[PDB]
Design a protein around this ligand. Structure first.
Ligand SMILES: *CC(=O)N(C)c1cc(Oc2ccccc2OCCn2ccc(=O)[nH]c2=O)c(C)c2cc(C#N)ccc12
Lengths: 547, 401
């Protein structure tokens, strides 16, 4: 016999202060008992388990479909935490094309990785005897059991340590481990490739691990995690949008899931209106009618998804480019590619929940998201193509009160273009009328007043019902904007309104803020000055609006 | 040569912090660095039985092209038991000049306690999540961990004993992996003394705190005041009245009586001039009841003033500033707001280390996603402070300009 190299065991402990499992065995039928006796006898002959005496106080239930199924849920609850088998799902657009990709079944190695000797006693299980007239057959595992918490991590780490020298001494090949399958890609000739496959089978045989010689079951196109992986391209598995006379909640969740999934390769997918119908819904079974916007969006999606689209694999010798387009209502779409018309992948970004916003902040956030995704998938930041002029961005970040930065990018003339819709003056405007604004409201009756007095003697006070102090301050500024010329100075004491306007929104939840924004767009020059309230600053008339 | 027992705080498990994505060049840099460290026994590979994690990334220090490994031990540092202490040298900030030296390599000569090593686990990530990462743990005192200077303190005293016995006029402070050496000599004599100390440490950053002072509140001096000038003056004085008690604005607010054009010149009355002068005299005095409490956090606020100018304040209680400043240095960041902010954070943190011996909690005028996306690209310091984000524009910005 050729000596087999031993696989180093991983030391395993239980969670602190906890003991091993002690679950009572369910009574089984005589047939199931016989089946489990045969299966366990074969496994004992193979070395996966061993018989133990009565001094082992631990026990884990065992079932039959025959096939043996040990329910390790209690031991899993009591087992220590391990390092994750994966910190994320690989994305197909990061894969590098290979002339050959071979699949090897290392499933038989799963039962060949030994379990920590001091931990085997916790895996004990009992086969019930016929008619329960003899003691049940006591077994314990010697290898990583299927279903135990630590089996995938210990198996993957053991396999990695085994493959490390082979991968190191063969840098011209790529070996990936996924579950009980190894994937070996290379650009070598098919003969040299199959040769190095045989060398890998020998190196694995040095640890007694057996690779099936007969032809495998997996072959292009690889179906994996909702993806189709082809020799030269990748895509998502076929996305079919169902025809429904009426849509329930789970149909809209299935639809938004299919559209989100498809949006990574199909460009222009929108999900705003369909996701909006799931607002504040608690029932999975409720039927919700479709808005007209949801119908138009769904039709656009059906037109985008009418024929297949494929992404290309990554080529590290070419540049990485990411282009963004604004879609409207806080929606953005983007394409990542290296050659024109050949996308690596696509995606979308929706604006965050907020009371006020503008297009520049959203484009910034989308750029950061794409930067992070691109560092994940490819380990580098792409060059950006953005629908915003260089001078627009320069004005923005030079005048914005926050620090902000976008990495290397170039302007692409694809409407709608992101622009600044208004810019407030830095100094008071000579010759422009000065509007002193103020508003106030009663906390009990919700009655208020908003208005202005100007240096030319112009005045206005408007009474308001169902209002607040903040609303009357905004309404006062709005009245000043309505009644002034193209250039106007505006004096307020509202720290609230100044906090809003200085954030430079172009869209808001408040219709009043949106009206103020439209007025600001219509103006040529607006200087907004703040003063402390109740300080006797004349012009600032608190009493005129508190009557 | 002998390990000292180290443990965590009661009831606290080790750190389990996600490793953030890294560029390919930083990953390869970490692969070379960690391979060399593994050859030297400083770190060892670990198996799946270690569930803890602390993030790692790679930087490039000043005047150097070699990559450097930087571990974000913040969570482990707050989870590590308190070590004990030495009172902070109040005379370090009073010295004329201070020089910062990186003495981190020395920590690698002292082995780390066995049962604690697993808490120093870190991961070199893989591109596209192809592998669970290359996992390591430290065998010696790691750089950036608060226990390293506490454990090495005796050895550091033994090494610095001859130098401190030779020059009693030089102040020596240690914070993390940095040694701050303050004196009053000439720049040339200070540099030769620094080479003397580095060759003294070899066998076994100019900074001038004397050129730094607290910034008083200043008011304009004008011969003609417009309505707008007076309104801004009253606003600033009203803000300052929260810091100084006897600030008075009613005589200056009298001039604003009436609905006048913003650009209209208003002459100051005699009562207004007297009130403004009294306010000036009040502002020339220090703030009443300002003290430092070592049990409270330090808070640092930063405002972007534009044109590469940044203001900052360090306080513990509102309106009780312990330090104020204005960083306007221009060093290869004229077109990058985030790089400027990161450099300002590093300088303010250094000043806070010199003054109080601990790092402040920052309030950054930046969105979370931008900062967290980009700050590691411009970080050059061994330590890392804490920060939160300001999403609403503060009105007091122009009152610090
Ligand atoms: C191993 C792994 O983590 N994944 C996600 C995985 C990768 C696959 O592709 C692969 C493996 C090794 C080397 C190179 C590549 O892919 C390069 C691009 N490419 C893909 C397919 C092809 O035919 N030719 C190529 O050049 C594959 C194929 C997988 C398949 C399955 C399944 N079933 C699961 C995971 C992976």
């Amino acid at each position: 016999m050729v000596p087999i190299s031993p696989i180093e065991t991983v030391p395993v402990k239980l969670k602190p202060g906890m003991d091993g499992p002690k679950v009572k065995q369910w009574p089984l039928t005589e047939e199931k008992i016989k089946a489990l006796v045969e299966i366990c006898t074969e496994m004992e002959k193979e070395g996966k388990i061993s018989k133990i005496g009565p001094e082992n106080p631990y026990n884990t239930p065992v079932f039959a479909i025959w096939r043996k199924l040990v329910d390790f849920r209690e031991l899993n609850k009591r087992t220590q935490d391990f390092w994750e088998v994966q910190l994320g799902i690989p994305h197909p657009a990061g894969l590098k094309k290979n002339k050959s990709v071979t699949v090897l079944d290392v499933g038989d190695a799963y039962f060949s990785v030994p379990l920590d000797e001091d931990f085997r006693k916790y895996t004990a299980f009992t086969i019930p005897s016929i008619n329960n007239e003899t003691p049940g057959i006591r077994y314990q595992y010697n290898v990583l059991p299927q279903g135990w918490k630590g089996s995938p991590a210990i198996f993957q780490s053991s396999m990695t340590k085994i493959l490390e020298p082979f991968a190191a001494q063969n840098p011209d090949i790529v070996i990936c481990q996924y579950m009980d399958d190894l994937y070996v890609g290379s650009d070598l000739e098919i003969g040299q490739h199959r040769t190095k496959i045989e060398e890998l089978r020998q190196h694995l045989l040095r640890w007694g691990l057996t690779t099936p010689d007969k032809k495998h079951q997996k072959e292009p196109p690889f179906l994996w995690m909702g993806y189709e992986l082809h020799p030269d391209k990748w895509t998502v598995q076929p996305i079919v949008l169902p025809e429904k006379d009426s849509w329930t909640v789970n149909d809209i969740q299935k639809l938004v899931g299919k559209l989100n999934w498809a949006s990574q390769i199909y460009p222009g997918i929108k999900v705003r209106q369909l996701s909006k119908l799931l607002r504040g819904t608690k029932a999975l079974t409720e039927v919700i009618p479709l808005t007209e916007e949801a119908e138009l969006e769904l039709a656009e999606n059906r037109e985008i998804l009418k024929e297949p689209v494929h992404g290309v694999y990554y080529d590290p010798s070419k540049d990485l480019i990411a282009e963004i387009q604004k879609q409207g209502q806080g929606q953005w779409t983007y394409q990542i590619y290296q050659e024109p018309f050949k996308n690596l992948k696509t995606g979308k970004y929706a604006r965050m929940r907020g009371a006020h916003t503008n297009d520049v902040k959203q484009l910034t956030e989308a750029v950061q998201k794409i930067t992070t995704e691109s560092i994940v998938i490819w380990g580098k930041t792409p060059k950006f193509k953005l629908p915003i002029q260089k001078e627009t961005w320069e004005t923005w970040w030079t005048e914005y009160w926050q620090a902000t930065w976008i990495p290397e990018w170039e302007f692409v003339n694809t409407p709608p273009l992101v622009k600044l819709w208004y810019q407030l003056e830095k100094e008071p405007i000579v010759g422009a009328e000065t509007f002193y604004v103020d508003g106030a409201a009663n906390r009990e009756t919700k009655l208020g007043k908003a208005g202005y007095v100007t240096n030319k003697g112009r005045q206005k006070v408007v009474p308001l019902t169902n209002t607040t102090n903040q609303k009357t301050e905004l309404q006062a500024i709005y009245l000043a904007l309505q009644d002034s010329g193209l250039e106007v100075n505006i004096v307020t004491d509202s720290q609230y309104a100044l906090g809003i306007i200085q954030a430079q929104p172009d869209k808001s939840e408040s219709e009043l803020v949106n009206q103020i924004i439209e007025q600001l767009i219509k103006k040529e020059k607006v200087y907004l000055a703040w003063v402390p309230a109740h300080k006797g600053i004349g012009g600032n008339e608190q009493v005129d609006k508190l009557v | 040569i002998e390990t000292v027992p180290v443990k965590l705080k009661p009831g606290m498990d080790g750190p389990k912090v996600k490793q953030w994505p890294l560029t390919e060049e930083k990953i390869k840099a970490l692969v070379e660095i960690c391979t060399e460290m593994e050859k030297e026994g400083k770190i060892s590979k670990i198996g799946p039985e270690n569930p803890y994690n602390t993030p790692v990334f790679a930087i490039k220090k000043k005047d150097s092209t070699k990559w450097r490994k930087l571990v974000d031990f913040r969570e482990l540092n707050k989870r590590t038991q308190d070590f004990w202490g030495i009172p902070h040298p109040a005379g370090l900030k009073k010295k004329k000049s201070v020089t910062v030296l990186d003495v981190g390599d020395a920590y690698f000569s002292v082995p780390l306690d066995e049962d604690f090593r697993k808490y120093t686990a870190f991961t070199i990530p893989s591109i596209n999540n192809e592998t669970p990462g290359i996992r390591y743990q430290y065998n010696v005192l790691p750089q950036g961990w608060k226990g390293s200077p506490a454990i090495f303190q005796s050895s550091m005293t033994k090494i610095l004993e001859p130098f401190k016995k030779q020059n009693p006029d030089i102040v020596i402070y240690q914070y993390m992996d940095d040694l701050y050496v303050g004196s009053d000599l000439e720049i040339g004599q200070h540099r030769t003394k620094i080479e003397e100390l580095r060759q003294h440490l070899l066998r076994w950053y100019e900074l001038h705190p004397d050129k730094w002072t607290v910034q008083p509140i200043v008011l304009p001096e004008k011969d003609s005041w417009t309505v707008n000038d007076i309104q801004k003056l009253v606003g600033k004085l009203n803000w300052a009245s929260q810091i100084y008690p006897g600030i008075k604005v009613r005589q200056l607010s009298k001039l604003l009586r009436g609905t006048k054009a913003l650009t209209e010149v208003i002459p100051l009355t005699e009562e207004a001039e007297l009130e403004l002068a009294e306010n000036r005299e009040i502002l020339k005095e220090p703030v009443h009841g300002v003290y430092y409490d070592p049990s409270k956090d330090l808070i640092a606020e930063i405002q972007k003033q534009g044109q590469g100018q940044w203001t900052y304040q360090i306080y513990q209680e509102p309106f009780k500033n312990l330090k104020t400043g204005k960083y306007a240095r221009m060093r290869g960041a004229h077109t990058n707001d985030v790089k400027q902010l990161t450099e300002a954070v590093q300088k303010i943190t250094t000043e806070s280390i010199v003054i109080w011996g601990k790092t402040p909690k920052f309030k950054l005028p930046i969105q979370k996603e931008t900062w967290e996306t980009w700050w590691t690209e411009y970080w050059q310091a061994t330590w890392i402070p804490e920060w939160e984000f300001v999403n609403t524009p503060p009105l007091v910005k122009l009152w610090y300009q």
